[PDB]
Design an enzyme around this catalytic site. Structure first.
Site, mmCIF file in Angstrom:
data_model
loop_
_atom_site.group_PDB
_atom_site.id
_atom_site.type_symbol
_atom_site.label_atom_id
_atom_site.label_comp_id
_atom_site.label_asym_id
_atom_site.label_seq_id
_atom_site.Cartn_x
_atom_site.Cartn_y
_atom_site.Cartn_z
ATOM 1 C CD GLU A 725 10.272 -46.698 -62.275
ATOM 2 O OE1 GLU A 725 10.693 -45.523 -62.319
ATOM 3 O OE2 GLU A 725 10.204 -47.429 -63.286
ATOM 4 C CG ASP A 726 8.284 -41.094 -60.790
ATOM 5 O OD1 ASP A 726 9.295 -40.575 -60.273
ATOM 6 O OD2 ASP A 726 8.225 -41.417 -61.994
ATOM 7 C CB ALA A 727 4.822 -44.948 -55.744
ATOM 8 N N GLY A 869 2.668 -38.278 -58.942
ATOM 9 C CA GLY A 869 2.680 -39.673 -58.555
ATOM 10 C C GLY A 869 1.322 -40.094 -58.042
ATOM 11 N NE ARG A 901 11.314 -37.856 -63.237
ATOM 12 C CZ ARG A 901 10.367 -38.492 -62.561
ATOM 13 N NH1 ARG A 901 10.292 -38.419 -61.242
ATOM 14 N NH2 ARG A 901 9.473 -39.218 -63.224
#
Ligand SMILES: [Mg+2]
Ligand SMILES: [Zn+2]
Ligand SMILES: [Zn+2]
Ligand SMILES: [Zn+2]
Lengths: 1101, 901
Positions: A725-727, A869, A901
């Site tokens: 989740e975009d970390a 992130g 994306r």
């Protein structure tokens, strides 16, 4: 034949010669040169109510940026001096008073009327024309573009408002009432008047005028302007048989009115009900004079031209009614004009000078009344000199610029200049803001118009409610400045135009408009436009003149006004561009400049009006005989921050917008002057680096001298659950070696105020006697003079400057402790301490505290492709996988965000970075002419790696190679100023607000988090009643009150008698205790403040 | 002892009540003297209370923080009309006689309408309708029926101006103005017997009270002055307006006493009326609002009670709370779904009061000894008498020994504590849930990844708040009702909301796909990592060359399922329906197939589980993904919430380990199509463009067939768009078929973990048409979008059709068209959020107080029955089997497999 590189060589010269803030500097210079004199001439002079006396204005001039020292004299002032001392960088204004006695002038006297703030690096600024080694010695950054104001030590920048073009007849459909409306905005001396002519369902024309209650009959108001003959009406409107038939119908419907005087009296009845006949007559003639198209003049002689203009408007309305012309399409750029800094400053000076002249006249009248007559006439010089009040002008101008609240209802024009880094400041200096309301949808206005090409950046726009209403100028954009109108009119007249007063607009004849007003008619329009184009290209007339013709309506438009947005283009003649190879060579060698190319007729600027007749080719190799112009550099249509993204055409538009927006938030060496800067907040990246894959525009604009990021070795792999989740996951060893390490700055301010009556503050160590004395622990780092020692480490709420204040009369013989302390949750080391004197001579102390910020969990990182992130985990180096060629990733990202994306440009930049780092030289990543992907893929294979960019890695824990080949490269990443160290916040009990007795607001004052009503509804939906009551009463506010159940009124408890009684009804037997929120008690008191009487009925249990 | 407010009855304050409830009369238009003390008799007189420190309110003693406040009053020189009651005053005046004051109705009609009113007038709308009918009836009578006298019409001019159109000589009216004293005298003589006919009440209100002669003054504590940093008192707006009112009243009194001319008195009366109506409501229609010295509009009583920042919605329905913390969030898959990672800095700041008992004395004593600096410490102790003591280094041991039964300790947070964990906006009820505290060293909240979908949170800078309940009952409510494992099934559609996302699904597919095999060390390590309490490995599935044993992914996954679960369905990877049909036939013919027969027909598109053994299929979003989860849905219903929580934790950890140690990545070559595919795509694009050109050529000569109801231009546009959409779909058809299952991007798309086929066909083959608001791009120059095209060109390329892909790069015109396309999406989201929020607020306020009674009916708070059976079947949607009241097929099947076993 020329190539895109040759065109780029020419293109960069434009930025080299003009700069990036021309829109502000040119406008301010024009204002200083002419607008002050224009505004002074508008008023003419003072007319005091003194017999046989009058004052006439003369010339005006600007002095030099100075400052009147309180305990001293005028001395030169410099921008760095003004920034630290919180002064206003302004220059005095000198004006000439010519006394007129007995109707005869005499020797003038020059007086100072006030101070005008000076735009930095303008032609009147001290920094103008100085070299780099002089700017450095003056404390300025040579890269600083200037173009802003310094007001009380704060940097104010005026954004450009995007208004509707003045004196333009725009026609729209009023389908709600089934009407057709034409609207014009007439400007004269800043005043605006919306004049409209409409055709209702009845087919009758009506005219709307400001300060008129109901629309008047069109024929009636035309009669009021003379021209009473019916045939005159029919000829003024037009000659078309259907037009004259409609006008016959209107005239038959308007046979009730007879002469102009009857119309004047009718309008007098409209405007001044119940008044005397003469009063209504005069004050309606006044409305006719100066509310009906004032831009035509206000003279009573101006009747005929106003009538002709109104007739042309009516003709436009009826033509739209017949379908002979389409809608106005006000979203088109030809109808839009920018309000530059000079125009707004002229308006502000106009209103301030009006106030000043009123005050001066009042002062001279008072002086003559109270001193006498022989005094004033004996010494006219003194009588004029000691009656001017410059502070009236200075205060209003300074306040209007500082607050951003503008006369006429405009707000937010002047904003605080953003100084986060280079890109943010430069982008802020180039903004266009729509004046509409943010809350409404405005789907038509927020859309990206087709004419925006080359004038407004398509991607750099805000994210929230301001999306589409705040826009940034493109790189090719150029903003015009007005030339004298009369010279243009005379030149147009000399070309063979017959005046409109001579003959009617026969459809055989073309109409000619100059800045929106009809001036005559020509037999051939195309011949006229070719004739004007030849002179404009040759050099006979100024370049700011733009001419376009519309074949269908037989109209020719000539534009020479201020605020148009244009773009340069190469002139193509007979299928051959006028730009040749030797011209490119001369530009490269420095023999020939951009202005010379403009004057040589090779490149001309096209506004929206002229571009309608053009047919522009994109590339030199696609030019043919049909084309009239050639695009200079297609990659320059983007804005300044949007140019940072390499290969922007490979990313989805939303991601490009996010990247362009985030490029203004990252840390870096914003300015070399940062060490002595006194900004409220600041940042400094320790090891900034030049991006390996970059656009050639950024080197030209000077960004590479002030980079704002670093190159990371990035591997695309799902290392653990800590990057979902975009970390993102970062290496510990690289962080410890100086990767993304940053420093944070914050400046505190403390004044030694001097109060009325002689009482004043004082810098000192607070004695234990004084009230408010905090713990001795917090004065551990103070010197005997009351100032902190530099390089001493401080903590939360530690005192930086010790200061005591005069006491408060509830005590007495006390001194309030008013020390300035560090913010409650901050920490760092004192960097520098500065002692100065304010404008009033009072001591001023500024202390800046620096804090090291090593990357940690929760810190935000973003690439320039819009991928952002936070750091999810910090991994030891030996746990990170390593490629079999000896590379360890600096950063690991999840492969899951990439397909959703759709940022292929980031994947291409990853290959390009490693290719550049392996071949030893940087890779060009220009928008549409950068190095293609296929070249980079082959070059990577040449160097010995695999063309896919995939390498074999071994797992850092098990020590065995992963099953799949892993994509690894080098990507430019930026550290954003959203650090967790500034966002974390927790409140145990804190203080409370005075009125509602609830927790305060914000981190700075130990505030509490908002518990919104939506959270209350969620709690109700869960059914947790006791949790809801706990959250809503005990944690925020609760109290006990005495309620008299007999009458419901709240009883009074007296602490003198230890007794409770009800005042309204005198009851003491039945006074029960009630538990309720304090806010509800305040609500009951507010209701009882009105005549509301809320009775309270109690119940048991 | 303590009583509660049972009901509230409203009304209108009478002058007697205002005079009696007041504490002082205001006569001086000033607040503070030179030194800073309140001026005697001023608007800040100490009788109303004290706001400055070190001052005692003589009315009730007290201090700045203790005195609640007391009301004052102003004796107005002459009566003025209340702005809130002006329209009602006009309604009353034109419906009653000028002479006798009686209602201008006939007696029998009065009786009929009184009979009508008593028939449940409590309903506000019906009462309003009846009163409107009475007003209309009384409007149209020029002559009073009760007494003989003519009645003139009355004209109401906003805000508080009343005109009387009374005739004069030669039959001409002069529109006499009614002064407020005349209106009050007219209203005063109205009898009480017919007040209900006017909608008023004889006791709670009176017509003459609506014209006020004495104005109450709010208490000082309701008008707090702010001492500005410059040392100058910043008065509140209400205080300033009161000063103006007092000044005008004093001037009017002086002029009246001095025999001023009538016009001056009238002007002063109007000025006082204007000041009063602005003080009551500064946004009243028809008046210029009063302005501050800075030029801003003042805020008055009506402003405080309205708006999002007003009293009702800003300080009553919601407020700022204590014991709360806010910081960014970061992922942590190693904690259980019902746990939250808390920074040690926050834990030592927030406290949970705890009472000393016989079973926790030693632990509290140890914490008190630890002091307020060691992590498991405390900050305050409360003796049974109720005094608060702050723990300090000089008090640790003494207070620890003083500690006994009945004391209260404000200890730091611990593991196992319960807290409220929230994200804004709070769109729906599972936006706030309760978590178990787990202390952490760093400064971010740690949230398990399976709990993201309920919060709609992603770790890109989001901040989420935390709340600590302070009372035992609140903690019990949070622990029982708000536990995370309770809300696995969403109440909106009866399906799971918490489930595996992204890497969970991808790792599940990698583990359970055909051909996956693992070695001894991998199996042992992954089972230990998942937390499975295994102590003996199962039999190896196959033997590798060199004699190494291998275990299949199915066997490893089967160790997490309950021992008796059985289910079969079709997942998103189904591509050859014959394979699934054969398995369905085999299962249907006999409800228990032979596992060695299923394993011959095993196919990845058909999931089938037999007694906890996974025999066919692969993990997919249908397995445990939130939207399509079936295994999780079956487990949570058939085995309780705790087993579901254990299963979810184990599967998440196992899939994360698999995806970590197998390697999973995407690169620039994931869209590398072969040359034949590019040729096919170019062929499709050229054919579409030629068709569009032919259509345009046919249109330009009037040969086009006009489609029904549409204009010819619209028919052309619709046909062109249909052709272009067909072309893009055709290109995507081959783009999908040339990228096989071995591509990681295709794996991510097909399994539903992330993205969809549209992203792939846009990145690899073709972007397609760009449009705004459902129509092709037209907002450019006259007849053309960009100046680079000839005017009147209707071709596909010239109107927005982009023929390139993101990989191949976009020409400048295509780039501009794409930006045009994206801007519409941005603004659409921006507006849609606000519109949805407003609609939801209206719905919430409409349906807030409905609830299910003990008898099963849903009743309004007024007792009105809305439903005689909730949802007409009585089944909670959360507990329903995906909308269905009960799943008969599942019950029958599971019963048969249980008993046939
Ligand atoms: Mg987010
Ligand atoms: Zn009472
Ligand atoms: Zn009191
Ligand atoms: Zn009567």
């Amino acid at each position: 034949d020329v190539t895109p590189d040759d065109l780029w060589i020419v293109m960069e010269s434009y930025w080299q010669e003009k700069g990036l803030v021309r829109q502000h500097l040119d406008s301010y210079n024009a204002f200083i040169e002419r607008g002050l004199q224009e505004v002074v001439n508008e008023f003419g002079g003072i007319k005091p109510d003194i017999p046989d006396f009058e004052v006439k204005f003369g010339k005006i001039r600007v002095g030099e940026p100075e400052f009147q020292e309180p305990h001293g004299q005028r001395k030169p002032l410099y921008p760095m001096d003004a920034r630290i001392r919180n002064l206003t960088y302004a220059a005095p204004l000198y004006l000439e008073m010519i006394p007129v006695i007995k109707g005869v002038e005499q020797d003038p006297v020059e007086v100072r009327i006030g101070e005008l703030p000076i735009m930095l690096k303008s032609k009147v600024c001290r920094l103008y024309g100085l070299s780099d080694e002089e700017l450095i010695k003056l404390g300025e950054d040579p890269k600083d573009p200037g173009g802003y104001f310094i007001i009380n030590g704060s940097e104010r920048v005026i954004v450009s408002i995007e208004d509707i073009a003045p004196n333009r007849t725009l026609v729209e459909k009023d389908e709600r009432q089934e009407k057709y409306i034409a609207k014009v905005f007439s400007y004269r001396h800043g005043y605006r008047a919306l004049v409209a002519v409409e055709r209702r369902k009845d087919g009758i024309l009506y005219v709307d005028i400001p300060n008129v209650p109901k629309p008047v009959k069109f024929v009636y108001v035309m009669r009021a302007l003379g021209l009473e003959r019916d045939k005159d009406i029919v000829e003024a409107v037009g000659n078309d048989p259907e037009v004259q038939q409609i006008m016959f119908d209107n005239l038959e419907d308007a046979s009730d009115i007879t002469t102009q005087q009857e119309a004047l009296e009718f309008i007098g009845k409209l405007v001044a009900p119940g008044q005397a006949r003469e009063y209504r007559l005069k004050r309606a003639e006044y409305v006719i004079d100066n509310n009906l198209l004032p831009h035509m003049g206000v003279s009573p002689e101006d009747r005929i031209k106003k009538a002709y203009y109104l007739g042309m408007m009516a003709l436009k309305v009826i033509e739209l009614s017949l379908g002979r012309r389409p809608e106005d399409d006000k979203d088109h750029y030809a109808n839009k004009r920018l309000r530059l800094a000079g125009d707004l400053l002229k308006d502000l000076f106009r209103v301030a000078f009006s106030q000043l002249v009123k005050d001066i006249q009042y002062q001279m009248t008072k002086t003559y009344q109270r001193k006498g007559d022989k005094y004033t006439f004996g010494n006219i010089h003194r009588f004029i000199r000691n009656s001017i009040r410059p502070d009236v002008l200075t205060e209003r101008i300074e306040h209007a610029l500082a607050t951003g609240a503008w006369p006429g209802g405009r707000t937010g024009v002047s904003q605080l200049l953003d100084r986060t880094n280079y890109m943010s400041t430069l982008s802020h200096l180039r903004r266009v803001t729509s004046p509409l309301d943010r809350e409404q949808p405005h789907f038509e206005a927020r859309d990206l118009h087709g004419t925006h090409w080359g004038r407004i950046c398509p991607t750099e726009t805000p994210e929230g409610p301001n999306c589409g209403l705040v826009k940034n100028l493109a790189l090719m954009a150029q903003i015009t400045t007005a030339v004298p109108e009369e010279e243009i009119r005379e030149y147009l007249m000399s070309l063979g135009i017959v005046p409109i007063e001579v003959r009617r607009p026969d459809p055989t004849l073309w109409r000619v408009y100059l800045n929106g007003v009809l001036i005559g008619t020509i037999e051939d329009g195309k011949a006229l436009v070719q004739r004007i184009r030849q002179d404009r290209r040759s050099g006979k007339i100024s370049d700011v003149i733009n001419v376009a013709y519309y074949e269908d309506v037989k109209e020719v438009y000539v534009n020479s006004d201020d605020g148009r947005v244009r773009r340069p283009l190469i002139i193509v003649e007979n299928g051959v561009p006028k730009l040749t190879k030797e011209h490119v060579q001369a530009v490269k060698e420095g023999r020939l400049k951009w202005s010379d190319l403009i004057k040589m007729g090779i490149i001309e600027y096209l506004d929206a009006e002229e571009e309608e007749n053009a047919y522009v080719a994109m590339w030199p190799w696609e030019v043919t005989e049909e084309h009239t112009h050639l695009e200079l550099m297609p990659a320059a249509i983007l804005g300044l921050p949007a140019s940072l993204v390499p290969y922007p055409e490979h990313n989805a538009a939303p991601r490009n917008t996010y990247g362009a927006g985030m490029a203004k938030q990252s840390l870096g060496l914003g300015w070399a002057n940062f060490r002595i800067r006194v900004d409220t907040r600041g940042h400094l990246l320790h090891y900034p680096q030049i991006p390996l894959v970059n656009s050639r525009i950024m080197k030209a604009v000077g960004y590479e001298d002030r980079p704002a990021g670093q190159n990371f070795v990035v591997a695309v792999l799902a290392y653990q659950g800590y990057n979902m989740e975009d970390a993102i996951i970062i290496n510990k060893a690289s962080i410890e070696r100086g990767l993304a390490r940053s420093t944070f700055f914050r400046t505190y301010e403390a004044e030694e105020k001097k109060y009325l009556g002689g009482q004043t503050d004082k810098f000192e160590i607070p004695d234990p006697t004084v009230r408010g004395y905090r713990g001795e622990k917090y004065y551990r780092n103070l010197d005997e003079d009351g100032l902190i020692f530099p390089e001493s480490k401080v903590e939360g709420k530690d005192v930086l400057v010790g200061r005591t204040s005069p006491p408060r009369f509830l005590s007495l013989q006390e001194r309030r402790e008013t020390s300035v302390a560090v913010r409650p949750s901050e920490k760092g080391v004192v960097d520098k301490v500065i002692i100065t004197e304010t404008g009033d001579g009072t001591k001023l102390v500024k202390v800046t505290v620096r804090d090291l910020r090593i990357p940690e969990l929760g810190d935000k990182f973003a690439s320039r492709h819009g991928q952002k992130g936070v750091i999810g985990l910090i991994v030891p180096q030996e746990d990170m996988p390593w490629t079999e060629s000896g590379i360890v990733p600096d950063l690991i990202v999840n492969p899951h965000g990439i397909p959703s994306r759709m940022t292929v440009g980031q994947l291409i930049e990853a290959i390009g970075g490693k290719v550049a780092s392996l071949k030893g030289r940087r890779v060009d990543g220009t928008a549409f002419i950068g190095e293609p992907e296929e070249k980079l893929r082959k070059e990577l294979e040449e160097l010995g790696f695999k063309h896919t960019g995939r390498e074999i890695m071994y797992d850092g824990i098990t020590g065995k190679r992963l099953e799949a080949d892993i994509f690894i490269g080098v990507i430019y990443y930026q550290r954003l100023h959203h650090m967790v160290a500034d966002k974390i916040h927790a409140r145990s009990r804190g203080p409370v607000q005075v009125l509602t007795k609830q927790p305060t607001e914000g981190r700075a004052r130990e505030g509490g988090l908002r518990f919104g009503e939506m959270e209350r509804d969620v709690l109700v939906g869960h059914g947790a009643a006791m949790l809801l009551i706990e959250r809503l009463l005990e944690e925020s506010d609760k109290t006990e009150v005495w309620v008299c159940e007999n009458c419901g009124h709240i009883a009074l408890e007296d602490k003198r008698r230890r007794r409770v009684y009800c005042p309204v009804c005198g009851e003491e037997e039945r006074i029960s205790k009630v538990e309720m929120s304090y806010a509800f008690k305040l609500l009951l008191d507010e209701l009882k403040a009105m005549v509301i009487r809320p009775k309270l009925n109690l119940s048991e249990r | 002892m303590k009583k509660v407010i049972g009901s509230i009855e409203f009304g209108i304050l009478s002058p007697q009540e205002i005079r009696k409830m007041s504490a002082v009369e205001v006569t001086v238009p000033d607040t503070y003297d030179d030194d800073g003390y309140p001026i005697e008799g001023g608007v800040m007189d100490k009788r109303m209370g004290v706001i400055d420190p070190g001052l005692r309110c003589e009315t009730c003693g007290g201090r700045a923080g203790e005195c609640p406040g007391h009301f004052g009053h102003i004796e107005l020189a002459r009566p003025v009309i209340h702005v809130g009651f002006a329209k009602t005053i006009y309604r009353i005046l034109e419906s009653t006689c000028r002479e006798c004051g009686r209602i201008k109705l006939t007696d029998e009609e009065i009786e009929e309408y009184m009979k009508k009113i008593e028939l449940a007038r409590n309903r506000r709308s019906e009462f309003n309708e009846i009163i409107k009918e009475i007003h209309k009836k009384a409007k149209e009578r020029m002559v009073c029926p009760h007494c003989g006298a003519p009645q003139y019409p009355i004209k109401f001019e906003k805000p508080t101006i009343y005109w009387e159109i009374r005739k004069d000589e030669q039959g001409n009216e002069y529109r006499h103005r009614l002064m407020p004293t005349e209106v009050r005298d007219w209203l005063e003589k109205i009898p009480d017997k017919d007040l209900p006919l006017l909608g008023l009440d004889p006791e709670k209100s009176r017509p003459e009270w609506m014209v006020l002669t004495v104005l109450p003054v709010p208490p000082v504590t309701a008008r707090p002055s702010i001492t500005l940093e410059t040392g100058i008192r910043a008065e509140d707006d209400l205080t300033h307006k009161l000063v103006d009112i007092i000044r005008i009243n004093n001037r009017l009194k002086q002029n009246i006493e001095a025999g001023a001319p009538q016009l001056i008195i009238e002007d002063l009366w109007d000025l006082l009326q204007y000041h009063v109506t602005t003080y009551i409501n500064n946004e009243a229609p028809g008046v210029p609002p009063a302005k501050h010295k800075s030029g801003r509009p003042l805020k008055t009583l009506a402003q405080r009670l309205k708006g999002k920042e007003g009293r009702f919605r800003g300080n009553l329905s919601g407020k700022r709370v204590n014991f709360s913390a806010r910081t960014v969030i970061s992922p942590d898959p190693m904690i259980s779904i019902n746990e939250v990672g808390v920074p040690v800095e926050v834990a030592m700041e927030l406290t949970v009061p705890e009472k000393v008992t016989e079973f926790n004395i030693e632990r509290l004593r140890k914490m008190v000894l630890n002091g307020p600096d060691k992590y498991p410490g405390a900050n305050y102790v409360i003796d049974p008498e109720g005094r608060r003591r702050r723990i300090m280094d000089s008090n640790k041991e003494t207070l620890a020994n003083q500690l006994d039964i009945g004391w209260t300790v404000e200890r730091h947070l611990m593991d196992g504590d319960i807290v409220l964990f929230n994200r804004q906006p709070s769109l729906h009820r599972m936006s706030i849930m309760a978590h178990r505290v787990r202390v952490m060293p760093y400064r971010t909240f740690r949230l398990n990844l399976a709990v993201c979908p309920p919060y709609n949170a992603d770790f890109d800078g989001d901040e989420m708040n935390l709340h600590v309940p302070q009372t035992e009952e609140a903690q019990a409510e949070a622990r029982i009702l708000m536990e995370v494992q309770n809300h696995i099934i969403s109440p909106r559609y009866g399906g799971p909301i918490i489930g595996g996302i992204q890497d969970h699904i991808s790792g599940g597919y990698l583990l359970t796909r055909e051909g996956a095999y693992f070695t001894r060390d991998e199996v042992e390590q992954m089972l230990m990592f998942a937390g499975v309490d295994i102590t003996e490995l199962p039999e190896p599935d196959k033997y590798d060359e060199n004699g190494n044993p291998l275990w299949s992914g199915k066997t490893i996954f089967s160790l997490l399922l309950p021992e008796d679960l059985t289910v079969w369905y079709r997942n998103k990877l189904c591509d050859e329906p014959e394979r699934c049909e054969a398995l369905e036939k085999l299962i249907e013919e006999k409800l228990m197939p032979d596992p060695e027969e299923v394993r011959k027909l095993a196919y990845d598109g058909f999931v089938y589980i037999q007694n906890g053994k996974l025999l066919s299929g692969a993990i997919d979003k249908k397995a445990y993904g939130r939207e399509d989860g079936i295994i999780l849905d079956l487990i949570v219903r058939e085995y309780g919430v705790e087993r579901a929580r254990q299963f979810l934790d184990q599967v998440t950890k196992l899939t994360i380990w698999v995806i970590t140690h197998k390697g999973f990545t995407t690169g620039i070559d994931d869209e590398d199509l072969p040359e034949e595919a590019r040729d096919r795509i170019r062929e499709i694009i050229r054919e579409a463009e030629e068709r569009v050109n032919k259509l345009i050529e046919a249109y330009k000569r009037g040969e086009l067939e006009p489609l029904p109801g549409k204009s010819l231009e619209d028919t052309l546009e619709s046909l062109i768009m249909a052709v272009l959409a067909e072309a893009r779909d055709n290109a995507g058809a081959v783009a999908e078929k040339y990228l096989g299952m071995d591509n990681h991007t295709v794996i991510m798309a097909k399994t539903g973990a992330r993205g969809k086929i549209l992203n792939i066909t846009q990145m690899a083959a073709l972007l397609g048409q760009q449009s705004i608001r459902g129509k092709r791009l037209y907002r450019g120059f006259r007849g053309r979008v960009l100046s680079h095209f000839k005017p009147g060109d209707l071709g596909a390329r010239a109107k927005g059709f982009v023929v390139n892909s993101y990989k191949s790069g976009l020409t400048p015109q295509e780039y501009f068209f794409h930006a045009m396309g994206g801007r519409e999406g941005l603004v659409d989201t921006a507006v849609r959020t606000a519109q949805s929020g407003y609609m939801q607020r209206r719905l919430i306020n409409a349906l807030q107080d409905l609830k299910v009674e003990y008898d099963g009916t849903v009743r309004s708070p007024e007792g009105i029955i809305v439903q005689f059976k909730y949802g007409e079947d009585g089944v909670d949607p959360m507990k329903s089997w995906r909308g269905k009241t009960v799943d008969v097929d599942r019950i029958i099947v599971r019963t048969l497999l249980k008993m046939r076993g």
